[PDB]
């Protein structure tokens, strides 16, 4: 559609990274977002860094968008789309992590489809 070829394609601009901040901002405010807000501690999880490969956190995320580091919508996705998935993998079902996960990620889904209608 015209978002989905927009979140591949179109750089991100100045504005576009108000948008993401906003965003990111209302994750880190979220009750469930507990888990996530800071990297894993390996003393929380202790195979956790033999097993994931590519952590992540919404401090890491924040600290790359202040620093301009996505081109496209589509790399900021994926980065927070691996908060989620390396949660999921890692942690059983009924893990309060896991648990978290699902409901950040469609809250996440709610802002980015917001943002993503207001590019226009
Ligand atoms: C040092 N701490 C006790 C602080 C509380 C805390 C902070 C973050 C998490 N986040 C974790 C932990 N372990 N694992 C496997 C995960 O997947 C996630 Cl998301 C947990 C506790």
Redesign the pocket.
């Known amino acids: 559609s015209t978002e989905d070829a927009m979140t591949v394609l179109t750089p991100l601009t100045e504005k576009d990274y108000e948008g993401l901040k906003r965003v990111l901002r209302s994750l880190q405010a979220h009750k469930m977002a507990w ?2 807000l ?1 990297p ?2 390996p003393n ?2 202790p195979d ?1 860094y033999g097993v994931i490969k590519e952590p992540m956190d919404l401090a890491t995320m924040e600290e790359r968008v202040q620093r301009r580091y996505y081109e496209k919508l589509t790399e900021f996705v994926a980065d927070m789309t691996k908060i989620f998935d390396n ?1 999921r993998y ?2 059983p079902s009924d893990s309060p ?1 896991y648990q978290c996960a699902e409901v950040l990620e469609s809250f996440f889904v709610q802002k980015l489809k917001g943002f993503k209608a207001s590019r226009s």
């Open positions: 888990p996530f800071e894993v501690d929380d999880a956790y949660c890692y942690n992590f």
